[PDB]
Amino acid sequence: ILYKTQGAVFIDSNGGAAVNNAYISRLGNTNGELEQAVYKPAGFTEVGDVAVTQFAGSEVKFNSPIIEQASFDFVHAGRDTDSYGLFMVDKPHIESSGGKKKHSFYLINTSSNVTLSGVGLSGQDPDLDSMYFLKNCPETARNVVRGQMPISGVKLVRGTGNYPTLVLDCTNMGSQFQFGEVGDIFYIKDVVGVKADTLYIDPVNGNNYNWGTNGTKPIRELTNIAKICQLFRCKSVYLNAGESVITSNTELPMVVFEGPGSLKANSGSSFLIKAGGTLSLIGLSGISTDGGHMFRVSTVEKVNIHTNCSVNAGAAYVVLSEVQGNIEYRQLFYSVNCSKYIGATAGQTIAGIMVKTATRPTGIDAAPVDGNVSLTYKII
Amino acid sequence: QPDGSYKLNKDVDYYPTGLDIDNGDAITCARKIDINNLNLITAPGVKVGVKWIGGAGCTTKGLSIGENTGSDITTARLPRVGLLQSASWGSIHENLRILYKTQGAVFIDSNGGAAVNNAYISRLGNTNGELEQAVYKPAGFTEVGDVAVTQFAGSEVKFNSPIIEQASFDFVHAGRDTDSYGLFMVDKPHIESSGGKKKHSFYLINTSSNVTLSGVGLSGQDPDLDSMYFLKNCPETARNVVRGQMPISGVKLVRGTGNYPTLVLDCTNMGSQFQFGEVGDIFYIKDVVGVKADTLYIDPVNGNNYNWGTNGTKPIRELTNIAKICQLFRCKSVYLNAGESVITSNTELPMVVFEGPGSLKANSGSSFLIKAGGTLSLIGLSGISTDGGHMFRVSTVEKVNIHTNCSVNAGAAYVVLSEVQGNIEYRQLFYSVNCSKYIGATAGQTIAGIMVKTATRPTGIDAAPVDGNVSLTYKIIE
């Protein structure tokens, strides 16, 4: 199909239908972005030519399509009632002159299974163009990505709606961590068979579009660092120079933090500890808060907090347990300031404390925790 | 031509590249060509059956090349190279049937979106097949032997359910020289060869791949050299993903060259490969999803490092990769068969239960390395000792528990040296222990708890069981 506005449109009942080795191309992409789709689901309101459009419950199988010069390679909506209609594309060969493109898979209220073949791109707008756009896909939906990412860097995903649905299933990422972008990490639901050792943060030069798992492409904010480390099984977080801040309670992953950066909780906010393990701050320029307790622990699992950097909780505590907790805190050298090292909101939390520095609130050597904490050991 | 004119190519070896088209150096005149059931036979010795050059969007169904003349291949009416294809994006070959002598089909340069569906490609028997020298092949492929399917220079043809028979090499595939572009894609290859003669099935050079195994295949008769996969210089960013079902008969999975592992087992149905097959070279496995094993078996006397190690009848021999192997297959324990399992350089131990009659030994001043939190348990072993180095070097800040229920001798060194600001609990149960300190640290404070429950211990350090860089949380002695 050589087309001007839309290549092929698939609507309503098409069960078991197949489209094999299609070759669908606009005649060049000049003014392609100004075409207006004629037959389209109500949820697709974007301007731009569309190679393949599918909606209203249609579930055609697309096997190895070649798609050329399109603003949108695929627009697919699930059925309005129940999101029925799986978007299925196996090894699409997607290309466009000058790298002009808006989205390759614009997916509305739907699930999908796509296998990439290493051929593809994202468009030139550094903000809006992405391989996937997930629009209002429901909580039970899954948009599964297998195969090989393009060799050249792309922005993977953007979306609207309250639920993540993108799944990386052993996706071959190539050099995307270094040269591409995730776009909006919010929309990734889970990741299988893809790992990275370290997440890089840079509050000055970082960019939140980045994956963050390659040092040349750090992210900027702390908002999603627990999510990202959980997804890619990161062992460390590296904080580049400057102050990494939160203004709302934010989870920290249980890993080693290193680098010249510092951590700051503002607006009365706290860092949240939600999983067992060890949190280590090693060699940072420091951590402090402007008035909230520093770490709020909401897990009953064994938590070790290891601070080898400057610590200042002011009038608040280094650790507040919101549950019946089990905590070991160790301060190594540098300095620490707080009214109590550890406290808890109710009836007992067991804790062990070591504070190895002369620069500490000496006056609480004899009473280092509030009444709701009982000590297993105290090494000061 | 030099003068700016154009002449029809009559050169047998010529094929156009994407570059040639763009330069204007070549213009394809092959559009709207369709083949349906053509049988092509050839006098013995003919170089090439079909040149599918520039055939973008052209299609084929039931194209048969080569005659099954008889048992003697040198006299058979078939070409040396069945099919040579380039610049044929969007072409489709259905039910291709090639009987060849040297190379079945060759795909080079731009073939974007091309498919080869249900091909049947076979040499006419494997007699002297190993001596065939491939004619059109990437520079990185220097081996001798016939090749059913060859692909290089950025060609990425989708192979759907091919049947490949009697080949020394089933597939030789190289990624593009500059950027490793060109995914090797084969869904369900049906691979057989008489007398089980074979070099490799997937010889992959500087490339990624996605292969779904269907349950039909083998590896060659050479016990050291023959393996299903050969991964030659695949880059750090490449992945060679293996899905589907392993062959019923044991095979050797993988060998390679280069410094980066790229093979991925993605819910691969291993069948009984742990018991009857071999990994070959564990170095080249990058990661494993949905494949598990409870126990890793080591046998310094009778083991073979080609083995998976996860079945008791096929233990591996050395300790070098036991941490890597336990991480991949999520092993819960390691069984040491009788004998001394030794290291001569610093080697990581997985945080699992070690049992069996074997002993562990660190020679040449080496140490066992503890790099992750959890519990390392040595239960009922014939002992662990070093010839002078610290026994366990801890480089993680996570909670580490060390539980030794066997004889322990670190000599003048420590049982545990923390190289970090550690958090260690050590317990010695019965048997005997010897060391200068149970726990020490390279620097500034490491918290520890210790229990030593045996009378055979260095009693002189009951009072100072750990060095000055370690602070005790509890101490249970006597």
Coordinates of N, CA and C in Angstrom, one line a residue, chain B residues 62-210:
Chain B
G62 N 8.1 -22.8 -3.8 CA 8.5 -24.1 -4.4 C 9.6 -24.0 -5.4
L63 N 10.5 -23.1 -5.2 CA 11.8 -23.1 -6.0 C 12.7 -24.2 -5.5
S64 N 13.0 -25.2 -6.5 CA 13.8 -26.3 -6.2 C 15.1 -26.2 -6.9
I65 N 16.3 -26.2 -6.2 CA 17.6 -26.2 -6.8 C 18.4 -27.4 -6.5
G66 N 18.8 -28.1 -7.5 CA 19.7 -29.3 -7.3 C 18.9 -30.6 -7.5
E67 N 19.6 -31.6 -8.1 CA 19.0 -32.9 -8.3 C 19.6 -33.9 -7.3
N68 N 18.7 -34.8 -6.7 CA 19.1 -35.9 -5.9 C 19.6 -37.0 -6.9
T69 N 20.6 -36.8 -7.6 CA 21.1 -37.7 -8.7 C 21.3 -39.1 -8.2
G70 N 22.1 -39.2 -7.1 CA 22.4 -40.4 -6.5 C 23.3 -40.2 -5.2
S71 N 23.9 -41.3 -4.8 CA 24.7 -41.3 -3.6 C 26.0 -40.5 -3.7
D72 N 26.6 -40.4 -4.8 CA 27.9 -39.7 -5.0 C 27.7 -38.2 -5.3
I73 N 28.1 -37.4 -4.4 CA 27.8 -36.0 -4.5 C 28.7 -35.3 -5.6
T74 N 29.9 -35.8 -5.8 CA 30.8 -35.1 -6.8 C 30.2 -35.3 -8.3
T75 N 29.3 -36.2 -8.4 CA 28.7 -36.5 -9.7 C 27.2 -36.1 -9.8
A76 N 26.7 -35.5 -8.7 CA 25.3 -35.1 -8.6 C 25.1 -33.8 -9.4
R77 N 23.8 -33.7 -10.0 CA 23.5 -32.6 -10.8 C 22.9 -31.4 -9.9
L78 N 23.8 -30.8 -9.2 CA 23.5 -29.7 -8.3 C 24.6 -28.7 -8.2
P79 N 24.4 -27.5 -7.8 CA 25.4 -26.4 -7.9 C 26.2 -26.5 -6.6
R80 N 27.4 -25.8 -6.6 CA 28.2 -25.7 -5.4 C 27.6 -24.8 -4.4
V81 N 27.1 -23.6 -4.9 CA 26.3 -22.7 -4.1 C 24.9 -22.6 -4.7
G82 N 23.9 -23.0 -3.9 CA 22.5 -23.0 -4.4 C 22.0 -21.6 -4.7
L83 N 22.0 -20.7 -3.8 CA 21.4 -19.4 -3.9 C 22.2 -18.3 -3.3
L84 N 22.4 -17.2 -4.1 CA 23.1 -16.0 -3.6 C 22.2 -14.8 -3.8
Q85 N 22.0 -14.1 -2.7 CA 21.0 -13.1 -2.6 C 21.5 -11.8 -1.9
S86 N 21.2 -10.6 -2.6 CA 21.5 -9.3 -1.9 C 20.6 -8.3 -2.5
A87 N 20.5 -7.1 -1.8 CA 19.7 -6.0 -2.2 C 18.2 -6.5 -2.6
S88 N 17.7 -7.4 -1.7 CA 16.4 -8.0 -2.0 C 15.4 -7.8 -0.8
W89 N 15.3 -6.5 -0.4 CA 14.4 -6.2 0.7 C 13.0 -6.6 0.3
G90 N 12.3 -7.2 1.3 CA 10.9 -7.4 1.1 C 10.6 -8.6 0.2
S91 N 11.7 -9.4 -0.2 CA 11.5 -10.6 -1.0 C 11.0 -11.7 0.0
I92 N 10.3 -12.7 -0.6 CA 9.8 -13.8 0.2 C 10.1 -15.1 -0.6
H93 N 10.8 -16.0 0.0 CA 10.9 -17.4 -0.6 C 10.1 -18.4 0.3
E94 N 9.1 -19.0 -0.3 CA 8.3 -20.0 0.4 C 8.7 -21.4 -0.2
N95 N 8.8 -22.3 0.8 CA 9.1 -23.7 0.4 C 10.3 -23.8 -0.5
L96 N 11.3 -23.0 -0.3 CA 12.6 -23.1 -1.0 C 13.2 -24.5 -0.7
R97 N 13.7 -25.2 -1.8 CA 14.3 -26.5 -1.6 C 15.7 -26.5 -2.3
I98 N 16.8 -26.6 -1.6 CA 18.1 -26.5 -2.1 C 18.9 -27.8 -1.7
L99 N 19.4 -28.4 -2.7 CA 20.3 -29.5 -2.5 C 21.7 -29.0 -3.0
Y100 N 22.7 -28.9 -2.2 CA 23.9 -28.2 -2.5 C 25.1 -29.0 -2.3
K101 N 26.3 -28.5 -2.7 CA 27.6 -29.2 -2.5 C 28.4 -28.4 -1.4
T102 N 28.5 -27.1 -1.6 CA 29.4 -26.3 -0.8 C 28.6 -25.3 0.2
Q103 N 27.7 -24.5 -0.4 CA 26.8 -23.6 0.4 C 25.4 -23.7 -0.2
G104 N 24.4 -23.8 0.7 CA 23.0 -23.8 0.3 C 22.5 -22.5 -0.2
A105 N 22.4 -21.5 0.7 CA 21.9 -20.2 0.4 C 22.8 -19.1 1.1
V106 N 23.0 -18.0 0.4 CA 23.8 -17.0 1.0 C 23.1 -15.6 0.8
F107 N 23.0 -14.9 2.0 CA 22.3 -13.7 2.0 C 23.2 -12.5 2.5
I108 N 23.4 -11.5 1.6 CA 24.4 -10.5 1.9 C 23.8 -9.1 1.8
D109 N 24.3 -8.2 2.7 CA 23.9 -6.7 2.6 C 22.4 -6.5 2.8
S110 N 21.9 -5.4 2.2 CA 20.5 -5.1 2.4 C 19.4 -6.1 2.0
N111 N 18.8 -6.7 3.0 CA 17.7 -7.7 2.7 C 16.6 -7.4 3.7
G112 N 16.3 -6.1 4.0 CA 15.4 -5.7 5.1 C 14.0 -6.3 4.8
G113 N 13.5 -7.0 5.9 CA 12.1 -7.5 5.8 C 11.9 -8.7 4.9
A114 N 13.0 -9.3 4.4 CA 12.9 -10.5 3.6 C 12.6 -11.7 4.5
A115 N 11.9 -12.7 3.9 CA 11.6 -13.9 4.6 C 11.9 -15.1 3.8
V116 N 12.3 -16.1 4.6 CA 12.5 -17.5 4.0 C 11.7 -18.5 4.8
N117 N 10.6 -18.9 4.3 CA 9.6 -19.7 5.1 C 9.6 -21.1 4.7
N118 N 9.8 -22.0 5.7 CA 9.7 -23.5 5.5 C 10.7 -23.9 4.4
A119 N 11.9 -23.4 4.4 CA 12.9 -23.8 3.5 C 13.4 -25.2 3.9
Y120 N 13.8 -26.0 2.9 CA 14.4 -27.3 3.1 C 15.7 -27.2 2.4
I121 N 16.8 -27.2 3.2 CA 18.2 -27.0 2.6 C 19.0 -28.1 3.1
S122 N 19.6 -28.8 2.2 CA 20.4 -30.0 2.6 C 21.6 -30.2 1.6
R123 N 22.7 -30.6 2.2 CA 23.8 -31.1 1.3 C 23.4 -32.5 0.9
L124 N 23.8 -33.0 -0.2 CA 23.5 -34.4 -0.6 C 24.5 -35.3 0.2
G125 N 24.1 -35.6 1.4 CA 25.0 -36.4 2.3 C 26.1 -35.6 2.8
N126 N 26.7 -36.0 3.9 CA 27.8 -35.3 4.6 C 29.2 -35.8 4.3
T127 N 29.3 -36.8 3.4 CA 30.6 -37.3 3.0 C 31.5 -36.3 2.5
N128 N 32.6 -36.1 3.2 CA 33.6 -35.0 2.8 C 33.1 -33.6 2.9
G129 N 32.0 -33.4 3.6 CA 31.4 -32.1 3.8 C 32.3 -31.2 4.6
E130 N 33.1 -31.8 5.5 CA 33.9 -31.0 6.4 C 35.1 -30.3 5.6
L131 N 35.3 -30.8 4.4 CA 36.4 -30.3 3.6 C 36.0 -29.2 2.6
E132 N 34.7 -28.9 2.6 CA 34.2 -27.9 1.7 C 34.6 -26.5 2.1
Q133 N 35.1 -25.7 1.2 CA 35.4 -24.3 1.6 C 34.4 -23.4 1.1
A134 N 33.7 -22.6 2.0 CA 32.7 -21.7 1.7 C 33.2 -20.6 0.7
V135 N 32.4 -20.3 -0.3 CA 32.8 -19.4 -1.4 C 32.5 -17.9 -1.1
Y136 N 31.3 -17.7 -0.7 CA 30.9 -16.3 -0.3 C 30.6 -16.3 1.2
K137 N 31.4 -15.6 1.9 CA 31.3 -15.7 3.4 C 32.0 -14.4 4.0
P138 N 31.6 -14.1 5.3 CA 32.2 -12.9 5.9 C 33.7 -13.2 6.2
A139 N 34.5 -12.1 6.3 CA 35.9 -12.3 6.6 C 36.2 -13.0 7.9
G140 N 35.3 -12.7 8.9 CA 35.5 -13.4 10.2 C 35.2 -14.9 10.3
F141 N 34.7 -15.4 9.2 CA 34.5 -16.9 9.2 C 35.6 -17.6 8.4
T142 N 36.6 -18.2 9.1 CA 37.7 -18.8 8.5 C 37.7 -20.3 8.5
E143 N 36.7 -20.9 9.1 CA 36.6 -22.4 9.2 C 36.4 -23.0 7.9
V144 N 36.8 -24.3 7.8 CA 36.5 -25.1 6.6 C 35.3 -26.0 6.9
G145 N 34.5 -26.3 5.9 CA 33.3 -27.1 6.1 C 32.1 -26.4 5.3
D146 N 31.2 -27.2 4.9 CA 30.1 -26.7 4.1 C 29.1 -25.9 5.0
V147 N 28.5 -24.9 4.4 CA 27.5 -24.1 5.2 C 26.1 -24.0 4.5
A148 N 25.1 -24.5 5.2 CA 23.8 -24.5 4.6 C 23.3 -23.1 4.4
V149 N 23.4 -22.2 5.4 CA 22.9 -20.8 5.3 C 24.0 -19.9 5.8
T150 N 24.3 -18.9 4.9 CA 25.3 -17.9 5.3 C 24.7 -16.5 5.2
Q151 N 25.0 -15.7 6.1 CA 24.4 -14.3 6.1 C 25.4 -13.3 6.7
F152 N 25.6 -12.2 6.0 CA 26.5 -11.2 6.6 C 26.3 -9.8 5.9
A153 N 27.1 -8.8 6.4 CA 27.1 -7.5 5.9 C 25.8 -6.7 6.2
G154 N 25.1 -7.0 7.3 CA 23.9 -6.3 7.6 C 22.6 -6.9 7.1
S155 N 22.7 -8.1 6.5 CA 21.5 -8.8 6.1 C 20.8 -9.4 7.3
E156 N 19.5 -9.2 7.3 CA 18.7 -9.7 8.5 C 17.4 -10.4 8.0
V157 N 17.6 -11.5 7.3 CA 16.5 -12.3 6.8 C 15.8 -13.1 7.9
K158 N 14.5 -13.2 7.9 CA 13.8 -14.0 8.9 C 13.6 -15.4 8.4
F159 N 14.2 -16.4 9.2 CA 14.1 -17.8 8.8 C 13.0 -18.5 9.6
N160 N 11.9 -18.8 9.0 CA 10.8 -19.5 9.7 C 10.8 -21.0 9.3
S161 N 10.9 -21.8 10.4 CA 10.9 -23.2 10.3 C 11.7 -23.8 9.2
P162 N 13.0 -23.5 9.1 CA 13.8 -24.2 8.1 C 14.1 -25.6 8.5
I163 N 14.3 -26.5 7.5 CA 14.8 -27.8 7.8 C 16.2 -27.9 7.1
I164 N 17.2 -28.1 8.0 CA 18.6 -28.1 7.5 C 19.2 -29.5 7.7
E165 N 19.7 -30.1 6.7 CA 20.2 -31.5 6.8 C 21.6 -31.6 6.2
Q166 N 22.4 -32.5 6.9 CA 23.7 -32.9 6.5 C 24.8 -31.8 6.4
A167 N 24.6 -30.7 7.1 CA 25.6 -29.6 7.0 C 26.6 -29.6 8.1
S168 N 27.9 -29.2 7.7 CA 28.9 -29.0 8.7 C 28.6 -27.8 9.6
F169 N 28.2 -26.7 8.9 CA 27.7 -25.5 9.6 C 26.2 -25.3 9.1
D170 N 25.3 -25.3 10.1 CA 23.9 -25.0 9.7 C 23.7 -23.5 9.3
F171 N 24.1 -22.6 10.2 CA 24.1 -21.2 9.9 C 25.4 -20.5 10.3
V172 N 25.9 -19.7 9.4 CA 27.0 -18.8 9.7 C 26.5 -17.4 9.5
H173 N 26.5 -16.7 10.6 CA 26.0 -15.3 10.5 C 26.9 -14.3 11.1
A174 N 27.1 -13.2 10.4 CA 27.9 -12.1 10.9 C 27.2 -10.8 10.9
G175 N 27.3 -10.1 12.0 CA 26.7 -8.8 12.1 C 27.5 -7.8 11.2
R176 N 26.9 -6.6 10.9 CA 27.6 -5.7 10.1 C 28.9 -5.2 10.8
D177 N 30.0 -5.1 10.1 CA 31.3 -4.8 10.7 C 31.4 -3.5 11.6
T178 N 30.6 -2.5 11.2 CA 30.7 -1.2 11.9 C 30.0 -1.2 13.2
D179 N 28.8 -1.8 13.3 CA 27.9 -1.6 14.4 C 27.2 -2.9 14.8
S180 N 27.6 -4.0 14.3 CA 27.0 -5.3 14.7 C 25.5 -5.4 14.3
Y181 N 25.1 -4.6 13.4 CA 23.7 -4.6 13.0 C 23.3 -5.8 12.1
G182 N 22.1 -6.3 12.2 CA 21.7 -7.5 11.5 C 21.4 -8.6 12.5
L183 N 20.2 -8.7 12.9 CA 19.8 -9.7 13.9 C 19.6 -11.1 13.2
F184 N 20.2 -12.1 13.8 CA 20.1 -13.5 13.4 C 18.7 -14.0 13.9
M185 N 17.8 -14.3 13.1 CA 16.4 -14.7 13.5 C 16.1 -16.1 12.9
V186 N 16.0 -17.1 13.7 CA 15.5 -18.4 13.3 C 14.5 -18.9 14.2
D187 N 13.3 -19.2 13.7 CA 12.2 -19.8 14.5 C 12.1 -21.3 14.2
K188 N 12.4 -22.1 15.2 CA 12.2 -23.6 15.1 C 13.0 -24.3 14.0
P189 N 14.3 -24.2 14.0 CA 15.0 -24.9 13.0 C 15.0 -26.4 13.3
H190 N 14.7 -27.2 12.2 CA 14.7 -28.7 12.3 C 16.0 -29.1 11.7
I191 N 17.0 -29.4 12.6 CA 18.4 -29.7 12.2 C 18.8 -31.2 12.4
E192 N 19.2 -31.9 11.3 CA 19.6 -33.3 11.4 C 20.8 -33.5 10.5
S193 N 21.6 -34.5 10.8 CA 22.7 -34.9 10.1 C 23.1 -36.3 10.4
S194 N 23.3 -37.1 9.3 CA 23.6 -38.6 9.5 C 24.8 -38.9 10.2
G195 N 24.8 -39.8 11.1 CA 25.9 -40.2 11.9 C 26.3 -39.1 12.9
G196 N 25.4 -38.2 13.1 CA 25.6 -37.0 14.0 C 26.8 -36.2 13.7
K197 N 27.2 -36.1 12.4 CA 28.3 -35.3 12.0 C 28.0 -33.8 11.9
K198 N 28.8 -33.0 12.6 CA 28.5 -31.5 12.6 C 29.7 -30.8 13.3
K199 N 29.9 -29.5 12.8 CA 30.8 -28.6 13.5 C 30.0 -27.8 14.5
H200 N 29.2 -26.9 13.9 CA 28.3 -26.0 14.7 C 27.0 -25.8 14.0
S201 N 26.0 -25.4 14.8 CA 24.7 -25.1 14.2 C 24.5 -23.6 14.0
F202 N 25.0 -22.8 15.0 CA 24.8 -21.4 14.9 C 26.2 -20.8 15.2
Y203 N 26.9 -20.3 14.1 CA 28.2 -19.8 14.2 C 28.0 -18.3 14.0
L204 N 28.0 -17.5 15.1 CA 27.6 -16.2 15.2 C 28.7 -15.2 15.5
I205 N 29.0 -14.3 14.5 CA 30.1 -13.4 14.6 C 29.6 -12.0 14.7
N206 N 30.1 -11.3 15.8 CA 29.8 -9.9 16.0 C 28.3 -9.6 15.9
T207 N 27.5 -10.3 16.6 CA 26.1 -10.2 16.3 C 25.2 -10.6 17.5
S208 N 23.9 -10.1 17.5 CA 22.9 -10.6 18.3 C 22.0 -11.6 17.6
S209 N 21.2 -12.3 18.3 CA 20.3 -13.3 17.7 C 19.1 -13.6 18.6
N210 N 18.1 -14.1 18.0 CA 16.9 -14.6 18.6 C 16.5 -16.0 18.0

